[PDB]
């Protein structure tokens, strides 16, 4: 029933769905607030109290599919997180270049959220998009170098990483799982 | 700058000086609150990046507005946001600086004396100024207008010397953080109480946020009470818990007095409670 | 100085659908990467079908009720189809893993000594699907192949062959796991939790084919065998990334 390319791993659009199902800070451009003198929102998979209390030009916290849906309307503009600034990305780049053995303390959804906000929020960034995408590509490349260095330690027992992103888990999942499964199969056949 | 039936104005002349007038004209009940009372603001000290603006705006008024509850606010050339508190009673009116935005700009930059970022004010919601943080050599924003950032108001009791001394991101110690939380909670509680008693609530959220604000008031007072009791200061602890508002948080002060072993403080706080039962 | 955190914390104090949905993707992400067919959360899925039915009649009643603020209706609509997608993908993945392990499941039903049964493991629709898929595959291979072979070799639940007739799930299949600690925020009630060097606690588990003890510190991701992590996943301490 399940397709062969969705058998033992997630597709990247399922990762997009998973990271669309998080809260995010946002600026409404419409007023749905009841004054002292309109059907309610009434959702069942997220808290609708922050969406019922939606005030124009304020900071609220809504789920990301609502964020993208309202950005398509341009009724509400998505605010980038703290780590999507040039200074914080430069700090992450310096941490990557400082400790070669350890990955930086980036969020798990740092590639997928960046792609979503680049392709959907082209006028919602205080810093320019240009150097932001340059630093995103630099962090992606240095994380690729670190996972290429760490792949020399493919052990039969176990293998650990600290702060690898979910999209990088789907980058490296079938290769690592198949190679370690066959290494374990070789050693378990080697046991008496 | 007018908001609904309220009108707020700033006057200046060489032979009168700087002043302000606040009025409420209405469809009825024509009452003028203050007429040309003097305005506590510093005009700018009269290179081309500032002179391009001060040839255009000699007064240094970046913006002039009302808050979300109707309290007047002004943003002068010294980059401080002045709110007029208790303007309905002219014998108790005072101008409260609630943001010295250069100090918080220096505070978010990790102590660096930062020039290339400026605050361009737009509005003041409750405990939050909405304003574009303009980056560059020019104070004013350009046509591709970015999202207006949010700056929480902080009472200017921050001295740079102590923050540089303890930090050998500027991390405020819990003592003066409790001090500024206590002062900010007190002035915001006064403002919310005045706007709820006089103009009423325009929504349903104002009473519960006032209760949570009095909660944050008492929590900051207990944190000042702890630093008083840590230095064996019975009298300062009694003065701190004498300004404690609710009877719920006095038992916490009794427990801190028990942890600090000050039984005379326990006796005097119980005498305060005895006064409070009737 | 005086430490005031306990008195202020005790002064501060002076089933839900969102948690159900988070548990639904916890089950979905644990199901997709696991080799073993996970136990069915019967109460959670019954509550989810009841909730999606009440939302279906709610959105149809508001459609009968149709200022025009159509954005709450659009929120209802994409709400319904995204919930339907999650439920569809979870049931489709577990149906595929039912189809992979049909012979294992019918032996596990046939073995009365084993405590695992399909009433504890599968839904009624999944039990019906597995049963009638086993009969239709059985009938296809009897009128295709096994009619022409003698009495020893028509068995499909055979064991004593040169190669094993029955499929078996990869119990030691390597999988990405991320530790969450206990499901609750109170850490001290877990007996398996123990404090280590550098402040960070860990879970200690033993691989028996190498006979080694390994430490899984809270807040880091690993790849481990599924037999090692089965008892932690059944107690819901990790999440299968």
Swiss-Prot record, chain B:
Residue ranges of WD repeats: 76-116
Subcellular locations according to the entry: Nucleus
Note: Present with 3280 molecules/cell in log phase SD medium.
Function text: Accessory factor for DNA replication. It plays a role in accurately duplicating the genome in vivo.
Name this protein carries in UniProt: DNA polymerase alpha-binding protein
Organism: Saccharomyces cerevisiae (strain ATCC 204508 / S288c)
Included range, full protein: 619 to 923 of 927
UniProtKB/Swiss-Prot annotation, chain C:
One Pfam family, short name: Sld5
Primary role: Required for DNA replication. Functions as part of the GINS complex which plays an essential role in the initiation of DNA replication by binding to DNA replication origins and facilitating the assembly of the DNA replication machinery.
GO annotations of cellular component type: CMG complex; DNA replication preinitiation complex; GINS complex; nuclear replication fork; nucleus
Species of provenance: Saccharomyces cerevisiae (strain ATCC 204508 / S288c) (Baker's yeast)
InterPro entries listed in its UniProt record: GINS_A (IPR021151), GINS_bundle-like_dom_sf (IPR036224), GINS_Sld5 (IPR008591), SLD5_C (IPR031633), Sld5_GINS_A (IPR038749)
Gene: SLD5
Keyword Transferase: no
Subunit and partners: Component of the GINS complex which is a heterotetramer composed of SLD5, PSF1, PSF2 and PSF3. Interacts with PSF2.
Name of this protein: DNA replication complex GINS protein SLD5
Keywords, sorted A to Z: DNA replication, Nucleus
Keyword Transmembrane helix: no
Effect of residue 27 to P: Defective in DNA replication
Effect of residue 240 to P: In sld5-13; temperature-sensitive mutant. Defective in DNA replication
């Amino acid at each position: 029933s399940l397709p062969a390319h969705l058998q033992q791993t997630f597709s990247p659009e399922e990762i997009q769905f998973i990271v669309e199902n998080e809260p995010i800070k946002i600026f409404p451009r419409i007023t749905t607030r009841q004054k002292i003198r309109h059907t309610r929102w009434q959702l069942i998979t997220t808290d609708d109290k922050a969406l019922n209390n939606m005030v124009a030009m304020r900071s609220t916290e809504v789920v990301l599919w609502i964020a993208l849906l309202l950005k398509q309307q341009s009724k509400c503009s998505i605010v980038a997180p703290q780590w999507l600034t040039t200074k914080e990305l430069d700090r992450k780049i310096q941490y990557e270049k400082t400790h070669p053995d350890r990955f930086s303390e980036l969020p798990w959804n740092w590639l997928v959220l960046a792609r979503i906000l680049f392709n959907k929020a082209k006028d919602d960034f205080h810093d320019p998009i240009h150097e932001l995408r340059g630093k995103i590509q630099d962090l992606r490349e240095i994380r690729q170098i670190k996972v290429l260095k760490g792949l020399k330690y493919l052990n039969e027992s176990h293998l650990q990483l600290d702060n690898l992103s979910l999209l990088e888990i789907n980058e490296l999942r079938p290769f690592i799982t198949e190679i370690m499964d066959k290494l374990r199969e070789i050693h378990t056949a080697s046991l008496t | 700058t007018a908001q609904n039936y309220r009108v707020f104005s700033v006057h200046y002349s060489q032979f009168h000086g700087l002043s302000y007038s606040l009025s409420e004209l209405g469809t009825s009940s024509k009452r003028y609150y203050k007429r040309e009372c003097p305005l506590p603001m510093s005009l700018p000290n009269i290179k081309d990046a500032n002179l391009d603006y001060y040839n255009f705006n000699p007064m240094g008024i970046k913006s002039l507005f009302f808050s979300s509850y109707g309290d007047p606010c002004i943003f002068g050339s010294d980059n401080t946001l002045l709110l007029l508190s208790k303007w309905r009673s002219p014998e108790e009116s005072k101008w409260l600086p609630i943001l010295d935005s250069n100090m918080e700009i220096w505070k978010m930059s990790g102590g660096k004396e930062t020039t290339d970022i400026h605050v361009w004010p737009l509005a003041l919601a409750y405990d939050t100024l909405n304003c574009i943080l303009v980056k560059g050599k020019h104070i004013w924003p350009e046509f591709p207008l970015p999202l207006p950032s949010e700056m929480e108001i902080r009472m200017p009791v921050f001295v740079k010397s102590k923050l540089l001394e303890e930090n050998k991101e500027i991390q405020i110690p819990v003592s003066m953080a409790a001090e500024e939380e206590y002062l900010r909670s007190k002035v915001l509680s006064e403002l919310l109480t005045d706007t709820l008693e006089n103009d009423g609530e325009m929504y349903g959220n104002e009473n519960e946020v006032l209760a949570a604000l009095n909660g944050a008031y008492d929590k900051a007072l207990l944190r000042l009470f702890a630093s008083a009791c840590s230095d064996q200061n019975v009298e300062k602890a009694l003065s701190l818990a004498h300004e404690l508002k609710q009877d719920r948080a006095l038992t916490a002060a009794v427990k801190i007095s028990e942890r600090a072993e000050l039984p005379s403080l326990v006796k005097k706080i119980n005498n305060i409670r005895e006064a409070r039962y009737e | 100085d005086i430490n005031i955190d306990d008195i202020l914390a005790e002064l501060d104090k002076e089933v839900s659908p969102q948690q159900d949905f988070s548990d639904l993707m916890k089950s979905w992400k644990n199901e997709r990467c696991s080799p073993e067919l996970l136990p069915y959360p019967h109460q959670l899925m019954k509550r989810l079908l009841n909730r999606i039915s009440m939302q279906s009649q709610l959105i149809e009643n508001i459609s009968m009720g149709f200022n025009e603020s159509k954005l709450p209706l659009l929120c209802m609509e994409t709400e319904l189809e995204r919930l339907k997608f999650v439920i569809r993908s979870y049931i489709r993945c577990r149906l595929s893993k039912i189809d992979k392990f049909s012979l294992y499941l019918r032996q596990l039903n046939e073995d009365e000594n084993s405590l695992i049964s399909l009433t504890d493991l599968l839904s009624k629709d999944e039990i019906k699907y597995h049963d009638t898929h086993s009969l239709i595959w059985l009938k296809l291979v009897n009128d295709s192949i096994l009619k022409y072979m003698p009495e020893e070799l028509q068995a499909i639940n055979d064991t004593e062959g040169s190669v094993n007739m029955i499929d078996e799930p990869d119990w030691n299949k390597f999988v990405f796991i991320h530790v969450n600690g206990p499901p609750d925020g109170k850490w001290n009630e877990d007996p398996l939790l123990q404090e280590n060097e550098f402040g960070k606690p860990c879970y200690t588990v033993t691989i028996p084919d190498l006979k080694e003890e390994v430490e899984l510190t809270i807040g880091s991701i690993y790849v481990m065998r599924y037999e090692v992590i089965r008892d932690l996943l059944r107690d819901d301490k990790v999440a299968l990334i």
